[PDB]
């Protein structure tokens, strides 16, 4: 994986803002951020998208939850997603037990949308008696064995080839339930749920930062890169909650 | 926040962000596919006294 | 009781621009004293890996 | 504005619209309070995705509307305790909210 | 000429010039009347490298 | 009548490039000239 | 220019054309020199006026 930028001689010259430390800043974070959707995008779609193959026999399920009710753009409503959400926990708890794999750690992951939703649904207006979740900067904290983190970028983070998002890439969400067999689509995620020691990542070579001078264009440039390999295994420790339709 | 700037009548001020990271394999130069840091930039203007 | 001939330190007048819409107009909009950045995000792994 | 949102997915300002009627089919006030607390938590969300720091967010409002989410909040009806404190009405917070 | 700036990418020196020189008559009001100061600014760009 | 602003000056740098197993040297400005109170400046010219 | 002159009608440009002239018809090597010296003049009467 590489990050890039090149920065002309006379543009740095009439400029007045360094704007070096700002650049390498953000390839670190570019980076970074590569890693991360690469790594979710990859639990969730290798996991539940692929047909006929469960690792070993009977090793694993690799369960995924389906939502209670009609269809939930059908719903349109802020609230009441909320109950559901907590249901599909509860059901979550239900098959991660009943596969074994430890009370603690596991963890959960949702969309901030959805989060919100989970929030709403222990508000002063409804429903009764003090919860989990604190009013005001709410925290939520748990929801039995998970942690539910809340990450603002789910879906894409493959990474490939071509600057532009679209052409070649390592690691994909796809678009629909029923064009590739799949069944986690892009539009179907509000949660997925994994053990830990469900998914792996392998390390060589690290990451580095350094510079160039090229004396050709009177320009020279920081570039940044780093190698590494993202796999799953394990999907017995791995599930997702998932829209119906 | 506030800020105090002298002399001028305008302030301006410059936002930036995002790349996209890539992939090259053993015998591709990097020159050919590169995107820019697209940066733009935000003016504010003294009314009057 | 207004008072003509004021100075107007910033207006062009010049032979030919005519118009003198506004003034003020000519000078300088200069600011050196603060970059914006876009957010910073963070990443929510490793430690659950 | 029309259009336009500064330095393209950047990001882009988001204006929570209002669930039930206009003014006329609201102002019972009770329910205003109401409204407010869920337009706030999902102006929390809005604001969430997008980043921005999480400390120091501040909330502005009136003395109309403020009385309203005094109104949403107390004995009847709004289930447990929570938040607000009487005695003057001052609200704590809501959502990482000053207020 | 040869004078140098550093930074940024233009610049404008300004011009004015000229007064009607006055002939105040004692106990009499000179506040009237001002011709003022005309003003006028001209500024050169660099083309790149 | 007419000056010239100079950023960066006069300055030259010597760079080595390997695949030609040679290298070379190369020197740069940065200037810029404008023209200034016109009324000071005149020309001959013949034509009728 | 084109009536762009600066500063209003205060300062004014200057340009001399050559008298009864023409490159074809001078080329004397002596009459150019007396042309060029006398627009010389006008050029240096015409630079102090403003």
Known sequence: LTADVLIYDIEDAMNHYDVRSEYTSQLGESLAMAADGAVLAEIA???????????????????????????????????????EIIAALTKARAAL???????????????????????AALMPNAANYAALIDPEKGSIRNVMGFEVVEVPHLTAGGAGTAREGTTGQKHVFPANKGEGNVKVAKDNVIGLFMHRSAVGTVKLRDL?????????????????????????????????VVFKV | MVRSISSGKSAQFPVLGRTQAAYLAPGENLDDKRKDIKHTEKVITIDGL | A????????????????????????????????????????????????
């Open chain 1, 45 to 83: 779609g290798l996991c539940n998208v692929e047909s006929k193959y469960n690792e070993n026999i009977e090793g694993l399920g690799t369960a995924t939850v389906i939502e209670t009710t009609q269809n939930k753009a059908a719903l349109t409503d802020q609230v009441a997603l909320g109950k």
């Open chain 1, 97 to 119: 037990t009943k596969n074994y794999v430890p009370a603690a750690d596991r963890v959960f992951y949702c969309d901030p949308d959805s989060y919100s939703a989970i929030l």
């Open chain 1, 208 to 240: 580095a930062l350094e510079r160039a001078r090229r004396a050709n264009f009177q320009a020279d440039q920081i570039i940044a890169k780093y190698a590494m390999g993202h796999g799953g295994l394990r999907p017995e420790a791995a599930g997702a």
């Open chain 3, 2 to 49: 207004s008072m003509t001939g004021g100075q107007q330190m910033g207006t062009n007048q010049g032979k030919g621009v005519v118009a003198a819409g506004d003034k003020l107009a000519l000078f300088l909009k200069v600011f050196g004293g603060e970059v914006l950045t876009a957010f910073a995000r963070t990443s929510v792994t490793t430690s659950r890996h």
